[PDB]
Amino acid sequence: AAQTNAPWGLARISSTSPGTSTYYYDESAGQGSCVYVIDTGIEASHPEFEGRAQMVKTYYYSSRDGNGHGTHCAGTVGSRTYGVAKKTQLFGVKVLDDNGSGQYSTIIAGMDFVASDKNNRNCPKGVVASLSLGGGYSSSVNSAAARLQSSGVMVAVAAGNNNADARNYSPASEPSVCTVGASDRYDRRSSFSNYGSVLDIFGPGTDILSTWIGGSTRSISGTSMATPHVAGLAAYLMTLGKTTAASACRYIADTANKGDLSNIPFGTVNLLAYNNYQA
Amino acid sequence: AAASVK
Ligand SMILES: [Ca+2]
Numbered sequence: 001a002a003q004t005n006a007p008w009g010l011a012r013i014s015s016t017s018p019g020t021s022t023y024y025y026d027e028s029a030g031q032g033s034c035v036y037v038i039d040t041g042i043e044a045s046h047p048e049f050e051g052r053a054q055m056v057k058t059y060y061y062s063s064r065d066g067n068g069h070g071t072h073c074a075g076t077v078g079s080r081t082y083g084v085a086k087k088t089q090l091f092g093v094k095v096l097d098d099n100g101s102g103q104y105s106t107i108i109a110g111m112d113f114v115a116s117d118k119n120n121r122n123c124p125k126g127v128v129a130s131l132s133l134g135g136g137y138s139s140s141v142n143s144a145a146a147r148l149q150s151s152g153v154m155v156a157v158a159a160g161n162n163n164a165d166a167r168n169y170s171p172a173s174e175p176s177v178c179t180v181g182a183s184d185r186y187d188r189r190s191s192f193s194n195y196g197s198v199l200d201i202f203g204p205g206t207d208i209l210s211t212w213i214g215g216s217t218r219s220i221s222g223t224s225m226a227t228p229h230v231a232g233l234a235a236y237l238m239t240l241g242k243t244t245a246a247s248a249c250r251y252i253a254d255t256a257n258k259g260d261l262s263n264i265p266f267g268t269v270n271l272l273a274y275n276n277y278q279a
Numbered sequence: 280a281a282a283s284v285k
Contacts, residue, residue, distance in 0.1 A: 040284065069284045100284035107282055135282035158285040224285040 001027045002279070007082055008185050009204025009229055014275050016257060018187050024277050026240060030085025033235035034123035035077050036114050036153075037130050037228070038107070039070030040100060042092035043213045046071065048079035053090035057113055059106050066098030068213045072220060073132045075211030076228040077235070082210040082217070084232025085239070089123065096133060104141055107133070111144040115151040126238030126245060130231035131157045131171060132224035138170045145171035154238075154245040156180055156231040158223035159194040166194040173198050178234075178249035182206060182226040183272060189263035193223055196268060200249050202261060203229035203273045230273050237275070 003010070006023035014024040043065050044053040053074060055063040065071045070092065078088045095110040096102040111129075118127045129148060134157070135141075149155045155177040159166045166172040172179050172194065179198050182190035182205025189195070190206045205226035209219045234248040243251035256271040264270045 067284070096282075096284060102282050104280045104282060133282050133284055136280055138280060141282075161285050222285050 001025050007209040009208050010084065012204050013084065013229060013233060013273050014277050018185065024279060025236065025275060026277060028239050030088035030232070030235040030239045032123070032125035033085065033239045034089045034091060034121055035128045035130060035231055035235050036091045036093055037070055037074045037077065038093040038095050038110050038114070039073055039132055040067035040096040040098060041065030041070045041094040042074045042090060043071045044092065046211050046215055048075060048081055048211050049090065050080055052078065052088070053092065055092040055094065056117060057110065058094035059109065060094060060097060063094055065213055067100050069100055069224065071213055072210040073130060073224060073228045076208060076225060077130060077232040079211050084229055085235040088232070088235045104135070104138055108141060108144040111148045114153060115148050118153065126235055127152065128154045128156065128231045128235050130228050131155060132227045134158055134160045134169045134172050136170065137168050137173060141170040142174035145174045145177045149177045152245050154178065154234045154248045156227050156234065158227040159199055161192040161222050162194055163192055164194050165196040166198050167196055169194065178230060180223060180227040180230050182223045183261055187260050187262060189261055190221065195265050199268055201230055201253055201256060201271050201273055202226065233273055233275060
């Protein structure tokens with residue numbers, strides 16, 4: 001399949017070279033896989049989700065996304081126009097308030113929810129969890145991410161936006177899960193992207209158009225925007241049978257474009273997510 | 280402690 005005049009990051013993940021604007025992907029499109037988005041919520045009514053997104057859990061007085069951050073990230077995973085895996089199911093876990101803040105105890109509660117809840121859903125091909133959030137180091141946050149991964153979920157995590165070593169952030173610093181850095185349209189590391197040996201993979205993160213609240217769309221930048229590209233790519237690859245939850249981060253790194261990026265510090269991998277599609 | 284969107 002080919003989606004013409006695609007947002008740049010979708011084009012980037014199906015290309016060996018920068019400078020193209022056509023997303024190429026297998027029509028299976030992540031069907032039968034599921035992705036949880038642990039964030040500020042998802043506007044499930046948005047036209048672009050086509051009835052494939054729902055809110056399953058909140059920890060606040062409402063399950064609606066009043067911020068927008070969660071809906072944008074959900075759109076890069078699974079919206080018809082802006083998403084990687086256009087036919088995936090999208091579950092929303094509201095762990096952050098409408099200001100984008102959340103206590104670590106609530107975040108952990110949402111992670112353990114995913115590990116259990118997945119057993120109550122129909123996701124025969126695969127289960128991913130996108131975690132576009134982070135904060136100060138904590139072994140307990142890292143352990144919850146480890147537990148989720150250990151249950152049979154692929155957990156993608158944003159490295160953080162401090163131009164800093166990601167070892168000091170959580171759950172970015174948990175080795176067993178997939179830690180995602182941000183790149184720009186000219187194959188540079190984004191100038192805000194955390195780096196370091198704990199990073200697994202880079203994905204598009206600067207100027208990423210996706211869905212917002214009110215049925216709208218906008219562009220924003222962050223490692224939070226790279227992470228849903230990788231979460232959607234894993235779902236897509238599990239639907240194709242190429243990899244499993246426990247092996248998808250490694251599969252992605254092995255199949256990635258290698259040595260494309262610039263602004264990579266010594267000690268950080270030079271690996272850009274690639275879907276390997278050959279029409 | 281408090282986490283935030285990235
Ligand atoms: Ca890893």
